[PDB]
Paper text:
Sterile alpha motif and HD domain-containing protein 1 (SAMHD1) is a metal-dependent hydrolase that plays key roles in dNTP homeostasis, antiretroviral defense, and regulation of various cancers in humans. In this study, we bioinformatically mined the SAMHD1 superfamily and selected the ortholog from the mycorrhizal fungus Rhizophagus irregularis as a model system for both fungal and biochemically intractable plant SAMHD1s. Ri SAMHD1 retains the substrate promiscuity of the human enzyme but bypasses the strict requirement for allosteric activation through tetramerization, positioning it as a prototypical enzyme in which hydrolysis and allosteric regulation can be uncoupled.
The symmetry of the tetramer resembles that observed for Hs SAMHD1 demonstrating similar assembly and subunit contacts. The active site contains a single Mn ion coordinated by four residues, including the HD dyad (i.e., H64, H103, D104, and D192), a configuration identical to that of the Fe-bound structures of Hs SAMHD1, whether mononuclear or dinuclear.30,34−36 Although Ri lacks a second metal ion, H129 – the counterpart of H233, which coordinates the Mg ion in the Fe–Mg site of Hs SAMHD1 – is similarly positioned in terms of distance and orientation. While a second Mn ion was not detectable in our structure, an additional weak electron density was present near the Mn ion, that was best fitted with a pyrophosphate molecule. In the Ri SAMHD1 tetramer, only one nucleotide (GTP) is positioned within the interface of three subunits (A, B, and D), forming an extensive network of hydrogen-bonding interactions with residues from the two allosteric sites. Given that the coordination geometry deviates from the typical octahedral arrangement found in Mg ions and coupled with the minimal presence of Mg in our samples, we have assigned this metal to a calcium ion. Overall, the allosteric sites are arranged similarly to those in the human enzyme, with the most notable differences being the presence of a calcium ion and the absence of a second nucleotide effector.
Author numbering:
A (entry chain C): 11 to 390, 392 to 451
B (entry chain B): 11 to 387, 389 to 451
C (entry chain A): 11 to 372, 374 to 451
D (entry chain D): 11 to 451
Write the structure that this text describes.
Amino acid sequence: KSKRIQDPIHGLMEFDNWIVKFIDTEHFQRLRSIKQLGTTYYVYPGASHNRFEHCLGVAYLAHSLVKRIRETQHDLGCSDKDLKCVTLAALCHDLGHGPFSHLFEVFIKMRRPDRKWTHEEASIMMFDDLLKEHKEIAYDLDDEDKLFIKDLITGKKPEDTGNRSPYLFDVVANKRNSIDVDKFDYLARDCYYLGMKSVFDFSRLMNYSRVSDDQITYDFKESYNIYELFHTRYSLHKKAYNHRVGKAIDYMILDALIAADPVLEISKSIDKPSEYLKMDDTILNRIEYSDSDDPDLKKSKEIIRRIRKRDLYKFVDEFLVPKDLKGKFEKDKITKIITDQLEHDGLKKEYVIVDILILNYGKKEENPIDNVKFYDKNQPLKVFKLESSQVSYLVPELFEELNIRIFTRNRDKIKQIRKCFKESLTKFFGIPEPKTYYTR
Amino acid sequence: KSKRIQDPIHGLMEFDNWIVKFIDTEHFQRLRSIKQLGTTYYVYPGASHNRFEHCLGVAYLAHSLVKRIRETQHDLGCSDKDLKCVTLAALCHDLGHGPFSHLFEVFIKMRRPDRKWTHEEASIMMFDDLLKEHKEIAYDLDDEDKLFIKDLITGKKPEDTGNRSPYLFDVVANKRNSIDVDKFDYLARDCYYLGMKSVFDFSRLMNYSRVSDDQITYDFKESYNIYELFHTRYSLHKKAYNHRVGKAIDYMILDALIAADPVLEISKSIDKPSEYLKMDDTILNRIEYSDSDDPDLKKSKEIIRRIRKRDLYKFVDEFLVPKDLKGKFEKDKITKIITDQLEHDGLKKEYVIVDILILNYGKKEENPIDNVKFYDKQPNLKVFKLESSQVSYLVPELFEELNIRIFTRNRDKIKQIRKCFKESLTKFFGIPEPKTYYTR
Amino acid sequence: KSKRIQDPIHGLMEFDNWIVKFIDTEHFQRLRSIKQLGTTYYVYPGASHNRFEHCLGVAYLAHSLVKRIRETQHDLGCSDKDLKCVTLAALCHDLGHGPFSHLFEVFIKMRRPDRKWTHEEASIMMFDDLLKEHKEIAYDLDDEDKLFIKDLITGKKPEDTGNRSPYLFDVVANKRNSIDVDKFDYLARDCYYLGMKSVFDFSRLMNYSRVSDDQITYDFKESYNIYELFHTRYSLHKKAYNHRVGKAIDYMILDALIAADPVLEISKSIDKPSEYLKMDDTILNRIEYSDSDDPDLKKSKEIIRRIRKRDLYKFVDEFLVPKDLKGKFEKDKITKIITDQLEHDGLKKEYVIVDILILNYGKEENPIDNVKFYDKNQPNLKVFKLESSQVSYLVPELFEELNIRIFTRNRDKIKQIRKCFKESLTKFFGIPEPKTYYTR
Amino acid sequence: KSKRIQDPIHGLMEFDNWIVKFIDTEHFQRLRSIKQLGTTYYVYPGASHNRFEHCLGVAYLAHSLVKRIRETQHDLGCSDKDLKCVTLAALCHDLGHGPFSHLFEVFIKMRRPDRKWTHEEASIMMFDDLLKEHKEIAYDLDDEDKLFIKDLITGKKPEDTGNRSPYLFDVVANKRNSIDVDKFDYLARDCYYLGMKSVFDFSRLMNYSRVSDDQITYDFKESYNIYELFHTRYSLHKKAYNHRVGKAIDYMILDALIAADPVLEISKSIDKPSEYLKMDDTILNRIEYSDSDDPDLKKSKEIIRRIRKRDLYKFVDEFLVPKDLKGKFEKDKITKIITDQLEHDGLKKEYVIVDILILNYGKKEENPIDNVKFYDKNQPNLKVFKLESSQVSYLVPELFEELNIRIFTRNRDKIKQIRKCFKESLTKFFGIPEPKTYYTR
Ligand SMILES: Nc1nc2c(ncn2[C@@H]2O[C@H](COP(=O)(O)OP(=O)(O)OP(=O)(O)O)[C@@H](O)[C@H]2O)c(=O)[nH]1
Ligand SMILES: Nc1nc2c(ncn2[C@@H]2O[C@H](COP(=O)(O)OP(=O)(O)OP(=O)(O)O)[C@@H](O)[C@H]2O)c(=O)[nH]1
Ligand SMILES: Nc1nc2c(ncn2[C@@H]2O[C@H](COP(=O)(O)OP(=O)(O)OP(=O)(O)O)[C@@H](O)[C@H]2O)c(=O)[nH]1
Ligand SMILES: Nc1nc2c(ncn2[C@@H]2O[C@H](COP(=O)(O)OP(=O)(O)OP(=O)(O)O)[C@@H](O)[C@H]2O)c(=O)[nH]1
Ligand SMILES: [Ca+2]
Ligand SMILES: [Ca+2]
Ligand SMILES: [Ca+2]
Ligand SMILES: [Ca+2]
Ligand SMILES: [Mn+2]
Ligand SMILES: [Mn+2]
Ligand SMILES: [Mn+2]
Ligand SMILES: [Mn+2]
């Protein structure tokens, strides 16, 4: 009946036999071969964790959070089916992730930019395919139930929630608060495995929440803890997720996948669920260990061998554009002028890689503790909202960061591309003195 | 002939006999009876630690850091005597702390305002008496070495450093960076004992620093870690150090010390070292259990019995002043108006307590990382200071935050003076509807 | 009403309003000044915790355990009244501890050996006085319920459990198994504060237990966890509790209390609860800082100054008896021949101290004795006992250890007393060569 | 030059540039695709770590320890070459590990028992190939240094260590104490990743040791800490390393490997370095993601399919032999009685699996604390001594060598039936009329 999974983050998690059925499926077990942080493992060797174990924690969190809500608020009318759908939604929210997680999206964009593929779109396809091949374990699931699970995976804004337990949309994919149990898991899981520390305490948000006004409301004593949630995500982005060598290795993995695409048809595995079953991170080993004499795979094997020998794409120069010049930036425009500068004075454009780095705290430029409602235990008083002049705390110095990083495929000539970077910056942005991150 | 002391933060601490004899002085062992966090133990039962164990950690960190500097930079001319002086400075930096730690500094502030007594001065007096009664253990120290220890304890600004190893002044009492091993210990110690998490890693700061420009410079990779030093301290202030009930219990202690002062001469103990040797946290127990029928001591026991019954001074409300009204504030000027407001409607002044809270991200109002010089293991020309864009992270919204907190010695008139605080706020130099802490 | 208290081991413990009424009493608040490990703080600086916080954890653990039992086994009939009794028993079990915890028990044994006093008896008396002094609290409990609480504080053998929830006797003071939530707290709290590690995990024993056969049964997969409970207690005794310098300072505190006993009536405070409320660890400070001219206070003050100066009683030698000579041992007899040996061939007998050390793993019982198990894998309701032939794990080399440790009050001579010990061993025991620990 | 690598166990690890060139070889980076705990990840999802990160820590600890010895005991004569040699042994001590670690040894033994191939032999084979294909990075090593490095990986008894710094054999593969920095790392790394606790503190063992009598001696105050090293490893075996379902999936992987061997020739990979370079855990995916219709491949594909659907081999029962009955026991002889009993009154023997579990507190039935020499800081004149019941009392295993007979079934419908045959064959093998198995109540 009930199962028990030992996890370093959540301890011992209990899953009912109903949950276990969807777990013991080739669709979900596929997540064991998909790394949670992609190429971070190649810079932070502790980041070996996969999306499989992360999804178990989100399902455990969502099930127990909704179970606490149902039992403490019996007048809410939340049914057993509502608890089952939110548990399946949490369990299958990352089912559609591809090899190296978000990097597969960039790969498919570079290959088929018109398909507009995204990982949670594949989550819908994989969820349906699991229900088709294992309809026995989903006998109790209705057609309106099946769409409920899919709508919770993607999340809905507070205006288009409907009448099917609107607070349940705050659990897995939060569009109003961005405070969800999925973030509770990976923030702590990645912190644990990267060997990093965090102040945010998700257990207090797990137990000291409540449902009011069709939304999950939190104790007003937890306001600074909610601050530390997005602070942990901000710090994780600034310390590990956006590491420069990790991005250089990311572009090498892309060039390898592109080269091996015509023979293996990697960018086509997303068209069929049967083909997506076999797509995971082991594709890198398949290319590496391929003995074929195809010039595509030979180029792809060379890039993979370059990873193993640490002969990676080197960094050239970085530039943070000021907020005053943010309006003039354009990814396609800045790429053309830079490549023209290499073509005019320099070498081939094949060497240079123009990378864009967008760091957004919260939702765009929105402050923390926005659209979240608070309560007081003493006053059993309507939900309230704290004003900007009522609470102060730590804040990101720059809410929106625009960084134009330059990588070179060839490690021979870096100083010439570094000079060419300043030449392109002074005539696109007009700044006579481009204050690049490598100042003089 | 050394001694290894086991500690939950630093593991096995190694102490040689030259300082062990200093640790085995009744002057140092007095710190066993002075809690590190004063009255925080009454709200956080885990905060049981005292200043004695903290000072052992600081002495351990100062000795190991300076020993590494001596073993890695032989050209600095740092002697074994210089190792002794900075180690002794660390051990005795908190020697002059009184009962309930900083609570005693504000007790003497009322009783003897002209004295302007600080625990840094008592540390000098206590250190002097230590050498007076234990001159057998200070035979190799001259007055120059003695005066060096005094200066290291008080800390000196970079300009007033002299040529007696100016870099050593950054070790125990940093007046330039605020990055000292004292902060290293108690931040890790308080987090461990309070049960709160920290984002700071002091071991990295200990192992990745070098001496240059007559100061302590840090690796560029530790820039984020330096931010998390003050992040951790800020969060600790916002959650534990400045707890409202902690200050409520504080004001009770001050009142009880005031009533017992004409009988016990508590405020006079800071004048003679042999009188100060008998002054610690236990004076509350001595007053509580004393059976004398003195009228001045009767009120002290009544206040102390109020603590045991948790019939404490009740928090009423607090007001976070806006940035625009900071210059419009004056502590003594505003206290007049709430005194006049209470005698109009309500009761007498004896029930209200006005409290000022100054929360500082680092000493005073400045970003402390702007005073840290860094080095990049691509050897830069000289040690450099981080520019505006070289690094961006979590900055405080208000570097200096002023909070007007209102406490009452009567628990029944919580709403009569909650109004009078708002009427005083709205009538003093403010706004039609003040937004205090409990306004919604 | 309900209050939550942060604890570094249990996180956030919630106490109902009826529990807070007991906490907010001078009887219970007295435990704030009763160190959990007595003089261990003088060897392990991290052991600054008190009996106050330990008691909160036992109450939280006991309450949470028995409440989960009723919510999962409704057929048991465990009423809300029984939940109240076992929670109070856990909260007040250590209410009778005196200064330095168990050390005070040895002190009263040496002073009034005919009283046969124990802190449990003082815990009942402190519980009776608490109710007498607070008539407004604890209205639900009747006289029969008051007897139940006292019986749970002392514990009862399975033959005298009665007919009112006999399983509840396993929660606080377990006599048939010794597996209780009291050990769950201090094993973890002492490890945390001493800076030690343990394999035992009380949380697994908390949520995976079942009540049957009028007792508390456990999952048979936790049989090795039960092994590690008693392993952790055995390891804590062998590493911290029984430290040789800890016992040396123990005798110093005892000698000082003896001198001051006629004046201060320390050993007589266990007769009147009103006198016992002022009996806490700060009594050492009142003696140390006394200005009285009585000769015993000077003798008491001189010993305390020896503690601060670290001129402690020096450990001379220690001898472990073999199993075949255990029966030929008697504390009074071996002390006499050692005393007579010092008197004839040596110095004054006041120098030598003869200390017995008994270390029992659990008598000589096996750690899985008398605990019944249920199989969660196969759905079952019957309990079973694991035979010794179907389990194998770690086990102490010596289940019972008897050591004769000798300390001297005079550190001028040691080798002389050490020689008298060896000659007394050959005269009291038939061995010609003494297998002491200071052989070489 | 030097590089700093962040690790959750050791924090920041520094590596000199010469060590980095070995790390950045395809032979070392292959360990990124080999799980440290084999199939344990299928039971404990936190145990996702690979041999690459574990070997990084071991080389870091081995370098730190030996570097300290050279700086605190100049008179020993430990050369830079010696420090280079032991660090390389630590980095390559797991170089020849096959897919799912210890599982591959059983696959070679089952397929080719005459070879008796061990991953130390493959470690030798892949270490020689590492230097052959990267000769520019090993220019300073001579033939004797290579023999020094190779022997440090295996380890040597105290009677077989020469005069070339014999204490260094205690750093990576300790044959006298079993106290090496290999255990220092994976004991902590496995606990951190499985989500389990440990009483051992390897930091104390790293700094409170001293070399004398051609060995590594430990401070007297660390005697309890040493006991907890083997306490932690013993506890890790009883809950994680020897999990029944982990062993059940171990046999599933084996059956699928034998079934796929005629087509993929997996067992031949242990012969040529170039082929073993492609040998890692990913072969589980290549077999299940192939598309050929070979009947041998179809049999292995089904086994992998039952892994994903948790239609695994079911644990039947376990029998701990008594100490008296341990002398009268033989693996091949007891197995015949069980198959004969199942072929008599049951179904075919293809469903039953006979597994013999051997748990050692040390290496065999010796106590490793009896082979470590201790010293005293307050008595430096006193020669290093062994523990001789003088303050030597702690927790020891009841059986220093635990022998367990476990039965697995390939079909879950015959669990109760095979359970009877296990007790039947137990009665006709041992002189025990009523055997008390694991599931007997
Ligand atoms: N070299 C190397 N670094 C690793 C490896 N695994 C994790 N890392 C970490 O990831 C980071 C990658 O940086 P580098 O390997 O130096 O890449 P790079 O900066 O282009 O190379 P350099 O220009 O020589 O510094 C390193 O600093 C390591 O801390 C590995 O296998 N090899
Ligand atoms: N001296 C001293 N030791 C402390 C103190 N706090 C904790 N300890 C620990 O207590 C242990 C025992 O104290 P010792 O000073 O060694 O007592 P002792 O063994 O009788 O004295 P010695 O003759 O110097 O060895 C030491 O090893 C320290 O690790 C302290 O404040 N002073
Ligand atoms: N009452 C009480 N609280 C404690 C104690 N120890 C720690 N605390 C914590 O300290 C916090 C302070 O709250 P209270 O003691 O109730 O003080 P208060 O808020 O002024 O009192 P109330 O108005 O009744 O809430 C509590 O929330 C507890 O979590 C204790 O011994 N008694
Ligand atoms: N079912 C299942 N168990 C897992 C999984 N991952 C880890 N485990 C753990 O492995 C343990 C044993 O696996 P089980 O699925 O129970 O397989 P089994 O014990 O041989 O057979 P059953 O208990 O009848 O299901 C479980 O108790 C889980 O804690 C998983 O993905 N599915
Ligand atoms: Ca309150
Ligand atoms: Ca000593
Ligand atoms: Ca099972
Ligand atoms: Ca680099
Ligand atoms: Mn996710
Ligand atoms: Mn300090
Ligand atoms: Mn207790
Ligand atoms: Mn290894």
